[PDB]
């Protein structure tokens, strides 16, 4: 019933089929060794940075409007995959994200777990522009807000317009998976390496935005447990930076 | 030279025409393409995907979450209604500006068939019956449990399934109007009852939701592209 | 006698041509309004005009292509230059044809400062002399940029890691577009507008994206007023038996 | 319906199915002025087709003149008539007069 | 280019030309056609059916 | 929101077509401008123009061409004429439409020396006949020298072994480009501006040469001032650990 | 005749045009061209010659030869750093008035890979030892020959080798304004 995988260290389990849903179809893979002439050549981790890499984990309680990661930016101070941000120019790398509800059987609600590639957000003021704490903190969970924002310095973090503009409903042409704690409690997403190019800046460009969104609001007895841990657990697969010789 | 005639239609400009064009630049190598992934080459792949369906769509329930929200509460009368609305995704305000619904705001004429998804999103020991009728483009909307229960059903018993996926015929809209006010339709309905209440254990609450899912099936065909209405600048 | 929607059954043969990336998005639509004159009236029209080519001023073109994250098309841009003469207290002239100069600057080339500019007889600065009466004229622009394709979304910065400017990249540099006559002088000043229009060929799209929901403010940004997800009625249930 | 020698011969059959080419002549004529000495440039005229579902213009400078699925014929004055052609655009499988 | 001559009758517009037109709408789907019953190719089959005469068309 | 330039990862390619010679030279460059009138106002304007054809005149194209040192090419010439009438108190008339006459006077052709000069009706003088409106003339003129190749370079003289004019040599001579109108008179004066445009087409090139330091002091010397070999900075080493 | 129409762009001019030209002077025999040595098809085969960088161009020093010669003196701190400059032979001063960079300099957007030779001219009796690192494009500028050896280096020894040739990856730079 229960399966542990183990990528260095150290070992998380998981269940034996958890509906893992890569991206679009595409397996995270390298740039098939084409590298000749030597003056694009690029470098590997090590090999590797493939570790699980587990975030500080979130309180989904009943009035909870849900919670986003940008990233590579969510892993920087994290091991070896940080300093590999800061010694590195250019960089590329796929994601397996895993998304554990650990709920009971006497508490129900629903959960969206999305991956938006170059999630644009807006401003809560317009004709302002925001700070990058507000953005994306070094391992922080940002959070959505139910109402609307007035912050003078932030993004609009209504949940029902998801931060961009649109109806949140139609956030399932992203990569997706539904946590129904009555059917489930976890979610596998395994993202590739979506961009216009082959490398990019780390620390300056967020390739895509993990999005927890609650659809079905978190509703329980009152002697129940009123917070519903939620962990994120990253695994950062095949990842490719640039040389850093000569010749 | 070759004798040549300017037949009609010669120094004009036809905002359909397809003739070659002088470059402005040659002499120029354009940058090749690579493997991103997700490449889509027709705009019926993002109507095939199920989007989840406001169906509370009440005020001040619009500005909220609460409209992708079914409530589902203990009944006092036997048969009440759930929900219901009407099965045509390009005027009906629950499902316009739904993923299917803004692709077909996009062109006049569609034609196909239409996937409604219910999700059950309560507790794991809430069970219970829901009636999700039918009515054909016809007529009309059923006025009770029975009524609903004589058309065409299905019977989603909540212990056990989670989900409750139907697939519905004959949906097609043409509309020879851009905006309309607002254009008599005759499209079908789907309205859920209940069929005997939810029952609990207890330390679990009465109260739970109902999410919704729409989209298309592999036969969808539109037709005649316009603008959509939804763009006011 | 108006108006109903149908059901009005049809026969099996399911189209769906009509709703590829091509002919979705390759559509002649006019993207800018170039209004420059024969002799200068004020700081505003003059001698001569310019326009950065970009993707998002024309809000029906702008939805449309920002339903995908990534695009890849070649341009065909084509004229309607008309002219029309200020009120002047009398208008008898002979006046010769008008020509017109319509100078794409690629990214990388000079653009003109001011009328008589050095930046008009560059050679890598490709120009098109129409006079008027003529067919409208016609360029083709081939992909442009880059990086391997146009990005409508950039969640990232332009400067030193976290600063600068969001959501600008230099990836989606298309070029100028300058207007101006040919002609020295008129006997009478004349007011000139050129209609600029866009059709999208090859189009490839990439990573599709929901529609947006809420109107635009800033031709720059993707900045918002927050909006219901959809209109509201008055019950969830149905009545009239 | 509004040319009636073209109705009559329309009308002899129930159902019509036809591809429509449509041409333009389009000719321009000075007002009765008190001076007409001027000196013109050369009149632009666009005639838009709107289809079944596209926006019609209320006025002049609407937003409907820019709609890029209204197809429009810009036509400058002394060159040959401009032509169109629509297909067969009826939603059913004939016209029915 | 090609070296061409315009010989006369060329910016005309001749009511009995049958020259190709640019399409106005393409990209469009033409809705085919069924079996109707009754399909006529010439205006003889309509005079090849038997009428009544008006004989008697004296006043009133 | 600019500027900065960026590493910017490329896939393995290796364009190398636009640095071809006939990429790199042949493009379309304005080399001259031409200004004659109707009527006569003075001797700098006057009924007819003339231009020896050189290629030292337009610094942009002269120093991509003074790269080699031995140069072929055939020449694609094209004009836009452009008419305006002078600051006249009235302009009201009725003007038939004004025909220009482009001549090119071979080397060994006579040039005119007045308006009515017999050298414009010269048979072995080729001329091009142009009507206002309609499309911009074109002419093609082969590679003309007598020797094999054109040289931007001559390290010699002209006279008796090293006397007459350094530098000069007739293995250059391309011919001569003469305009003015066909029509009689108009019935007020009309000023007319011809911008020649060159194309050199199957260009060859011969003998690498460095690249010009200094700026042009004369359009027939390689006369110059000094002047530093770069630009100026403080250190020759790096700070900012 | 044959039914015509014409298309928008008919009577026009585009400069990026190719067509065909009536030929002003036709019954003329062009001269034929010979064997003219150094025959050169594309400016890659200009930009791929060595030429000497100045690197000592401060002033007065660059109205000189001196702007050629790097100063290599007795030293009384141990470590000093000799020269450095910025690896984009389009902008930096000492490079883009070079072979190289005036053809870079020419086009807007280019990739490849530079040669840098060091060519040592002292006397045939003086030995000593020089540490030539390299940067990445990332970052950046070392302040001591410790954290230069900790990086790209090439140690060159001035009494085995006379000459240094170390080849670059990596140098692309796009600029989109004109100055």
Known sequence: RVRSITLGNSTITTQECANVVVGYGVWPTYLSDHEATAVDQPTQ??????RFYTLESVKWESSSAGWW??????????????????????????????????????????????????AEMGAATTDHAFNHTKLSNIGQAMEFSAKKSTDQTGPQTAVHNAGMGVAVGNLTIFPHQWINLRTNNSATIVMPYINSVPMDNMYRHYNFTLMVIPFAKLEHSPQASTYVPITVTVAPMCAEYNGLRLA | ?????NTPGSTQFLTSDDFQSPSAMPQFDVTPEIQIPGQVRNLMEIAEVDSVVPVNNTEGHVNSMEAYRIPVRPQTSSGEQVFGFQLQPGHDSVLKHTLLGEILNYYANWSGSMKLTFMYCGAAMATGKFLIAYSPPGAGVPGSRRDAMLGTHVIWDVGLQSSCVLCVPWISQTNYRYVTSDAYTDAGYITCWYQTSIVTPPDIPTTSTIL?????????????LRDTPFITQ | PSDTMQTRHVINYHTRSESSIENFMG???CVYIAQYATEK????????????????????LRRKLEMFTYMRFDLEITFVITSSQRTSTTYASDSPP???????????????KSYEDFAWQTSTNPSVFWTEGNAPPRMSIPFMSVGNAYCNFYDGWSHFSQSGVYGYTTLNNMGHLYFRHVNKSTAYPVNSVARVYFKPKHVKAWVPRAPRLCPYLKARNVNFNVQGVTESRNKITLDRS
């Open chain 1, 45 to 50: 981790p090590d090999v590797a940075t493939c």
């Open chain 1, 69 to 118: 990661w940008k990233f590579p930016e969510a892993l920087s101070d994290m091991g070896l995959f940080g300093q590999n941000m800061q010694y590195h120019y250019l960089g590329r790398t796929g994601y397996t994200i895993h998304v554990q509800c650990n709920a009971s059987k006497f508490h129900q609600g629903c959960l969206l777990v999305v991956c938006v590639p170059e």
């Open chain 2, 1 to 5: 030279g070759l004798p040549t005639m």
């Open chain 2, 212 to 224: 919704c899912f729409v989209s298309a099936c592999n036969d969808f065909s539109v037709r005649l």
């Open chain 3, 27 to 29: 559509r002649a639509a």
């Open chain 3, 41 to 60: 009236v004020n700081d505003e029209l003059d001698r001569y005009t310019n326009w950065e080519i970009t993707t998002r001023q024309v809000a029906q």
């Open chain 3, 98 to 112: 008008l020509t017109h100069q319509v100078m794409y600057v690629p990214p990388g080339g000079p653009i003109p």
